[PDB]
Amino acid sequence: CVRLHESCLGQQVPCCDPAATCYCRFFNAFCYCR
């Protein structure tokens, strides 16, 4: 799994945090669970 404050860029596991949202702020660079 991945934490909220942990990028998910091309990941293979979900976010340990269900209240998190793997979103990217920019176009294709920074992407983490917000």
UniProtKB/Swiss-Prot annotation:
It is found in: Secreted; Golgi apparatus lumen. Residues 1-34 form the Agouti domain. Expressed primarily in the adrenal gland, subthalamic nucleus, and hypothalamus, with a lower level of expression occurring in testis, lung, and kidney. Residues 25-27 are annotated as: Interaction with melanocortin receptors. It comes from the Eukaryota. Disulfide bonds join C1-C16, C8-C22, C15-C33, C24-C31. Transmembrane segments: none annotated. Interacts with melanocortin receptors MC3R, MC4R and MC5R. The presence of a 'disulfide through disulfide knot' structurally defines this protein as a knottin. Plays a role in weight homeostasis. Involved in the control of feeding behavior through the central melanocortin system. Acts as alpha melanocyte-stimulating hormone antagonist by inhibiting cAMP production mediated by stimulation of melanocortin receptors within the hypothalamus and adrenal gland. Has very low activity with MC5R. Is an inverse agonist for MC3R and MC4R being able to suppress their constitutive activity. It promotes MC3R and MC4R endocytosis in an arrestin-dependent manner. It is linked to Obesity: A condition characterized by an increase of body weight beyond the limitation of skeletal and physical requirements, as the result of excessive accumulation of body fat. This is Agouti-related protein. The lineage of its organism: Eukaryota, Metazoa, Chordata, Craniata, Vertebrata.
